[PDB]
Amino acid sequence: TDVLQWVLENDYDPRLISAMSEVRNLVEPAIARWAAERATSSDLAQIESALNEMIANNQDREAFNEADIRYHEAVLQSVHNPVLQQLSIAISSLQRAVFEGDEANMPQTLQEHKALFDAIRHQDGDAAEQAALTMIASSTRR
Amino acid sequence: TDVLQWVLENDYDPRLISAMSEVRNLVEPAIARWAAERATSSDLAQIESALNEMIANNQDREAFNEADIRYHEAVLQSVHNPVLQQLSIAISSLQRAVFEGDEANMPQTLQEHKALFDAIRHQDGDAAEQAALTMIASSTRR
Ligand SMILES: [Zn+2]
Ligand SMILES: [Zn+2]
C-alpha cells in the first residue's frame, strides 16, 4: 500500500543494494581518508569518546545506536566539508529509511570502528579507506 | 538581508569554493568513469544529440544552457544509478543556487564536452575522469 513496496523487491532488492553500495564505497572511504588527513586531536577525542561509549553501552540497542551515530558524526565533522557532510547525511538517512539483531555481529562492529579510529589517528589514509570499505561490506553482507 | 550573504564572503568565498570543488572532483569524475564503463550506444546517442545542440545553439544563452543541462542529464542517466543521480542533481542545484558571460569561454566549453563524450564512447575511464576534472577546473577558474 506504499509505493516503495511496489517498486522494490521485498526483503532483498539487489539493484538498489548495488546502487547504494556503489555510492557508499565512493563517498565514505573518501570521508575516511580526508578525516585521516585533516582530523585534529580534538577531533580524535570526539571520535574516541563515541567509540568508548559504543564499547561500554553495547547492551541496549538504543544507547549503542545513539553512540554509533555520534561516532560517524564526529568522523564526518573531522572532514570539515559542509557540502560533503550534507551529502553523507542524505545517504545515511536514505539507508535507514529504506533498509531493515545487531548483537550477533557486535564484536566485529566494534573492531571495525576501532580500526577506523586507529587509521584516522595514525593519519593513514590507505588504512582509513580500507576500514571504511570493510565496514560497508559488513553492512551489506547482512 | 539574506543570511547566505551574511555567512559567505561576497563574490569569492574561497572555503565554500574549495568544499564544492572537492565534492565535485569526487563525484563527477566517478560518474564520468562509470558512464564510460556502462553507457550503451543508445546512451551515446542521447549525449551526442545534446552535444550537437550545444554546438548549434551556442548563440542564445538559454537554448545553449538548455542543451548543456540535457548533456549532463544524459551522461548521468548512462550511469544507471538513481542514488548517485539524485546526489549529483543535488550538487548541481546547490552550485547554481549559490554561485554566479559564458561566450568568452564558449569554444573551450564545447571542446571539453566533446572530449568527455569521446572518452565515454571510447569506454576510456581514465580519459573520462580527466575530461570531468578539466571541466570542473575550468568551471572553478571563473
Ligand atoms: Zn557504525
Ligand atoms: Zn556543461
Residue numbers in the entry:
A (entry chain A), B (entry chain A): 79 to 178, 183 to 224
Task: Please share text taken word for word from the publication where this structure appeared.
DgoR was previously predicted to be a FadR family of transcription regulator, and repress the D-galactonate metabolic pathway by binding inverted repeats in the dgo cis-acting element using D-galactonate as a specific effector molecule. As the representative member of GntR superfamily, FadR family is characterized by the presence of a helical domain at the C-terminus (FCD domain). It metabolizes D-galactonate through the enzymes encoded by D-galactonate operon (dgo) and a modified Entner-Doudoroff pathway, where D-galactonate is degraded into D-glyceraldehyde-3-phosphate and pyruvate, and then enter central metabolism.
In our study, we systematically investigated the D-galactonate binding pocket of DgoR using X-ray crystallography, Electrophoretic Mobility Shift Assay (EMSA), and Micro Scale Thermophoresis (MST) assays. Meanwhile, a molecular docking model of the C-terminal domain of E. coli DgoR (EcoDgoR_C) complexed with D-galactonate was established based on the crystal structure of EcoDgoR_C. The key amino acid residues in the binding pocket that are involved in the interactions with D-galactonate were predicted and further validated by site-directed mutational analysis. Moreover, our study shows that some divalent cations (e.g., Zn2+, Mg2+ and Ca2+) are essential for the interaction between DgoR and D-galactonate, but also reveals a unique divalent metal-containing substrate binding pocket, which is the largest one in the GntR superfamily reported so far. The structural information on substrate-enzyme interactions derived from our experimental and docking studies provides a better understanding of the structural and molecular details of effector interactions between sugar acid and the FadR family member.
